[PDB]
A paper describes a structure:
We report that SARS-CoV-2 infection elicits a population immune response that is mediated by a lineage of VH1-69 germline antibodies. By cryo-EM, we show that it targets a semi-cryptic epitope in the spike receptor-binding domain. Binding to this non-ACE2 competing epitope results in spike destruction, thereby inhibiting virus entry. On the basis of epitope location, neutralization mechanism and analysis of antibody binding to spike variants, we propose that recurrent substitutions at 452 and 490 are associated with immune evasion of the identified population antibody response.
The bound Fab adopts an orientation perpendicular to the spike 3-fold axis. Through HCDR2, R1-32-like and R1-32-related antibodies can bind all known spike conformations, particularly the RBD ‘down’ conformations, and in so doing expose RBD, or disrupt spike structures. We hypothesize that binding of this class of antibodies impairs spike protein conformational masking, resulting in increased antibody binding and elevated immune pressure.
Author numbering:
A (entry chain L): 2 to 214
B (entry chain A): 340 to 580
C (entry chain H): 2 to 228
D (entry chain B): 14 to 70, 76 to 339
The structure:
């Protein structure tokens, strides 16, 4: 709302990375103290530094907070393996009559090399046809990273209805896997000749088709 | 919105507003005929628009009717020493008025708070939001409503059916800052009556000339303000009105 | 200390939600307790803060009079009531603690937080789930490894787990996450990899546990005969 | 963020001649039917000016860091709005108060702050497949910024993002001056039908807004924008396109100029006093027409190039060795 933040920032593991929070002259520039928090995706956020002058118990001394007039700054030294979270700037605003947070910056490395994907197409079974629905599944597994564009075709036109893509999760052998469904009806399932799932991964296009008859 | 809002704040955490890169007129705050008390120390109430400063710090909170005399430099009590201290060099300007029909309701409106107990004195222009239990005795109590431990923050008794000296009074203070900086928020001569065809004296931001103001027939380009002639005399000034 | 909150909870679009905030030990009846929310897509908002000693409410101007937070001194717990839910209430709330101090700033900080309460609301409420068997064909199996499993369709709500032979199968299992649908529903998948020599001797049975619906469907998997 | 380029074959800049260019309003007052002279930073006529190309058909892309002097003259025969904005600074390492006056497709942003200027900041226009319109997506001008004070938003201006290879139809002139810390911008659009060798026409330049920044500027650099169509692979290493543009960079010299004012009050002619003896006669006499006769313009003083000081003939060495 009244507090804006950059969407993303780049840094190197070993240099100094600085961030800024800019607002108005009534919440941060009026004289109120700022509070920085860390939002880790998978646990509750904790307190890092309050007032930009004291150090709580349990936090390292690598975080440095300062207030340069109407803007606050946070500087860190060294990127460890725990900085894959979001940083927010929180200040007490008088116009909103309460505390308001910022936008949030993402600072996580990609670390996602390329690999070769492998798809499998499974037609619906016989018990699923009497349920007045047709779920055409499209499983992709053993690929890296998890950024696959899923498209469907029926040998005469691309399918732009009922298309869904799931987010891939990490496997036990450092791979990704996902599945794509197609909500259809059994009335038109036997009328068409075939169905297919087309995906791409860095130009690699693998095609697999089935036949209902 | 600082004056007219849906609700206000308390005295242990009050609203702090800064006026920067703005221009205002203090003439509409004097002829309102709606304020109860009006005190303005350090500068006369009618000659403060000509002299202007660097910054304007305005704080807004609520207070009872019997404590409006405590907002002044040079006295002791319960509110003016534990919530907001007034220094000796206080050139502020306090404005108070009654709006008992908005910040109170039937059954007991206790939404605003105040601090009653404190360990020692505090520096002026400092906010205190400490919710720690003030220990009176010599033994620690570890946050319990037992003996020798009392909570400093207590509730109000605002009721709209009260008298005059105990109603919620909306009090605001307008303080000025004097540092090594040019004038920002300022009061400039407003706008008098436009007169023409008489032997008048004007000051249009670049000169003080005495003469008449006749209606010309030539239109100037929309980027100039003055105008010279063949004999090198500024005899054409565009009116900024 | 530590603050314990409830787990996941789902409700109806226009009904009331009832969550709680538990405190382990003390230091709860002396400091203010607020509620901070967080939604994926936008920043973090702040509804209001409640003092437990005097029992005085303090909300914000951005939130209207639709949420009420109460406190209790006998068991040191706090409750949250919110009715007339909307489509943007899919977020998580946190039970935070405030510790004031002195200084020129004097801003409210959140030193102690809670666990988290996932409160999501949408259409397509809880109904009976339908699971379907999947069998490999003669064309889908070219070597000595076959792929088969069970698909769960029209299930609600999260979370639902899938076990293979009551947990007797560990190597080769893979659980796929859910996905939002156009109707507001989810669908997952679970496939395994077994040698082709065990398809005629040992059977594979999927068992689904849906603790919010109390439905346990035990179905059979058989290979197709025509291909 | 910014990326680096790849070494390729470029084209050297040429030197052309100006023809009655670099005339603006020297004050903010009105003048009519008067021949008055002033001492301001103007451009001498028939002077040697630099010429830089921006056409693709090859791969001409030169944006050097030129030193900013007291008053510059930036004239561009813009057709499809390729040049977006300009930057200013001294060292460009987030140490001084750099300037950023850019003209985007939404609004003009004049932000004097401490942005991290890279080696070559440039705008990027990507062509969408489903949408048949040129949209800007690669916003690579700076990395980040920590804290600054000045921030101003100008009036909105609509720009065309589609670049062609045809002839130019408009001409835009920009004058940036810095006196007593105040920044001046003189801009006026003038339609013309020419590619090179600017005509001998006359056109004044009116200012829009004065910026009291109160800092010193010694270097300046212009920004160029490229297009990403389906003919190029889309990488900023060796394959790109820039359309067709031509901008002139001139340095204003402190020379007095005689201006002409009609009944309307606009500038009609300009007469120098340090370029031609014929023009020196007209401004010294304060008349645009000269009859027969002899006049005196200035004096001729020969400056000494040597300075000798010889007090003794030979220093007689007393016995000390
Ligand atoms: C001053 O305000 C009047 C009316 O609001 C307007 O007509 C006039 O153009 C303004 N003068 C300026 C903007 O210089
Ligand atoms: C300049 O103004 C005069 C009258 O003020 C007018 O007659 C003349 O046409 C104008 N010249 C232009 C608009 O070029
Ligand atoms: C300086 O010395 C030269 C040679 O030693 C001599 O010829 C000359 O007369 C001297 N000048 C004097 C003594 O003023």
């Amino acid at each position: 709302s009244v507090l804006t933040q950059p969407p993303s920032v780049s840094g190197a593991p070993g240099q100094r990375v600085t961030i800024s929070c800019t607002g108005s002259s009534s919440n941060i520039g009026a004289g109120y103290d700022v509070h920085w928090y860390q939002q880790l995706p998978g646990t509750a956020p904790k307190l890092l530094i309050y007032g930009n002058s004291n150090r709580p118990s349990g936090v390292p001394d690598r975080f440095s907070g300062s207030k340069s007039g109407t803007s606050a700054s946070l500087a860190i030294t060294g990127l460890q393996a725990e900085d894959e979270a979001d940083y927010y700037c929180q200040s007490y605003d008088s116009s909103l009559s309460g505390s308001v947070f910022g936008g949030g910056t993402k600072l996580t490395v990609l670390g996602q090399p390329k690999a070769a994907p492998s798809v499998t197409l499974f037609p619906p079974s016989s018990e699923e046809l009497q349920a007045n629905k047709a779920t055409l599944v499209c499983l992709i597994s053993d690929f890296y990273p998890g950024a696959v564009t899923v498209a469907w075709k029926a040998d005469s036109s691309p399918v732009k209805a009922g298309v869904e893509t799931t987010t891939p999760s990490k496997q036990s052998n450092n791979k990704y896997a996902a599945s794509s469904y197609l909500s259809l009806t059994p009335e038109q399932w036997k009328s068409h000749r075939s169905y297919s799932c087309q995906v791409t991964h860095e130009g690699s296009t693998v095609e697999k088709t089935v036949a209902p008859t | 919105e600082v004056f007219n809002a849906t609700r206000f704040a308390s005295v242990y955490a009050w609203n702090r507003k800064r006026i920067s890169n703005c221009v205002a007129d203090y003439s509409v705050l004097y002829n309102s005929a709606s304020f109860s008390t009006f005190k303005c120390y350090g500068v006369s109430p009618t000659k403060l628009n000509d002299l202007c400063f660097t910054n304007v710090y305005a704080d807004s909170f609520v207070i009872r009717g019997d404590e409006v005399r405590q907002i002044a430099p040079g006295q002791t009590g319960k509110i003016a020493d534990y919530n907001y201290k007034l220094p000796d060099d206080f050139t502020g300007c306090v404005i108070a008025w009654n709006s008992n029909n908005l910040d109170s309701k039937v059954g007991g409106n206790y939404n605003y708070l105040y601090r009653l107990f404190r360990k020692s004195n505090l520096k002026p222009f400092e906010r205190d939001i400490s919710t720690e239990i003030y220990q009176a005795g010599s033994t620690p109590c570890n946050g319990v409503e037992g003996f020798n431990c009392y909570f400093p923050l207590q509730s109000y008794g605002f009721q709209p059916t009260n008298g005059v000296g105990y109603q919620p009074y909306r009090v605001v203070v307008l303080s000025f800052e004097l540092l090594h900086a040019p004038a920002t928020v300022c009061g400039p001569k407003k706008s008098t009556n436009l007169v023409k065809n008489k032997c008048v004296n004007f000051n249009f931001n670049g000169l003080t000339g005495t003469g008449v103001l006749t209606e010309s027939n030539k239109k100037f380009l929309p980027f100039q303000q003055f105008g010279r002639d063949i004999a090198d005399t500024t005899d054409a000034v565009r009116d900024p009105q | 200390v530590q603050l314990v909150e409830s787990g996941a909870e789902v409700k109806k679009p226009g009904s009331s939600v009832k969550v709680s905030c538990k405190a382990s030990g003390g230091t709860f009846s002396s400091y203010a307790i607020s509620w901070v929310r967080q939604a994926p897509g936008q920043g973090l908002e702040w509804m209001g803060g409640i003092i437990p000693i005097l029992g005085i409410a303090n909300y914000a101007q951005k939130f209207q009079g639709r949420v009420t937070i109460t406190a209790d001194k006998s068991t040191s717990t706090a409750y949250m009531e919110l009715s007339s839910l909307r489509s943007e209430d899919t977020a998580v709330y946190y039970c935070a603690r405030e510790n004031g101090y002195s200084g020129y700033g004097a801003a409210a900080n959140f030193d102690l937080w809670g666990r988290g309460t996932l409160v999501t609301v949408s259409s397509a409420s809880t109904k009976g789930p339908s699971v379907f068997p999947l069998a490999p064909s003669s064309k889908s199996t070219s070597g000595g490894t076959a792929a088969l499993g069970c698909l769960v369709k029209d299930y609600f709500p999260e979370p639902v787990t899938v076990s293979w032979n009551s947990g007797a199968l560990t190597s080769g299992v893979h659980t796929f996450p859910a996905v939002l649908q156009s109707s507001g529903l989810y669908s997952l998948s679970s496939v395994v990899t077994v040698p082709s020599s065990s398809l005629g001797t040992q059977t594979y049975i999927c068992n689904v546990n849906h603790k919010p619906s109390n439905t346990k469907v035990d179905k059979k998997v058989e290979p197709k005969s025509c291909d | 963020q910014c990326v680096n380029l790849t070494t390729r074959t470029q084209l050297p800049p040429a030197y052309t001649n100006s023809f009655t260019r670099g005339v603006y309003y020297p004050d903010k007052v009105f003048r009519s039917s008067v021949l008055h002279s002033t001492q301001d930073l103007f451009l001498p006529f028939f002077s040697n000016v630099t010429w830089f190309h921006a056409i693709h058909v090859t791969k001409r892309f030169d944006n050097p860091v030129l030193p900013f002097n007291d008053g510059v003259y930036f004239a561009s025969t813009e057709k499809s709005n390729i040049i977006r904005g300009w930057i200013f600074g001294t060292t460009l390492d987030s140490k001084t108060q750099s300037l950023l006056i850019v003209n985007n497709a939404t609004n003009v942003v004049i932000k004097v702050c401490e942005f991290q200027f890279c080696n070559d900041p440039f705008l990027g226009v990507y062509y969408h497949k489903n949408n048949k319109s040129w949209m800007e997506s690669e916003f690579r001008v700076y990395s980040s910024a920590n804290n600054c004070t000045f921030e101003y938003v100008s009036q909105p201006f609509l720009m065309d993002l589609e670049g062609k290879q045809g002839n130019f139809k408009n001409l835009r002139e920009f004058v940036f001056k810095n006196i007593d810390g105040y920044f001046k911008i003189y801009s006026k659009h003038t339609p013309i039908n020419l590619v090179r060798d600017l005509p001998q026409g006359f056109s004044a330049l009116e200012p829009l807004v004065d910026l009291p920044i109160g800092i010193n500027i010694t270097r300046f650099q212009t920004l160029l924008a490229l297009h990403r169509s389906y003919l190029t692979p889309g990488d900023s290493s060796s394959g790109w396109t820039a359309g067709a543009a031509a901008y002139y960079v001139g340095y204003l010299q402190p020379r007095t100029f005689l201006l002409k004012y009609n009944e309307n009050g606009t500038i009609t002619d300009a007469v120098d006093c340090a370029l031609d003896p014929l023009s020196e006669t007209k401004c010294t006499l304060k008349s645009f027409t000269v009859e027969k006769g002899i006049y005196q313009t200035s004096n001729f003083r020969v400056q000494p190039t040597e300075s000798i000081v010889r007090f003794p003939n030979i220093t007689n060495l007393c016995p000390f060795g």
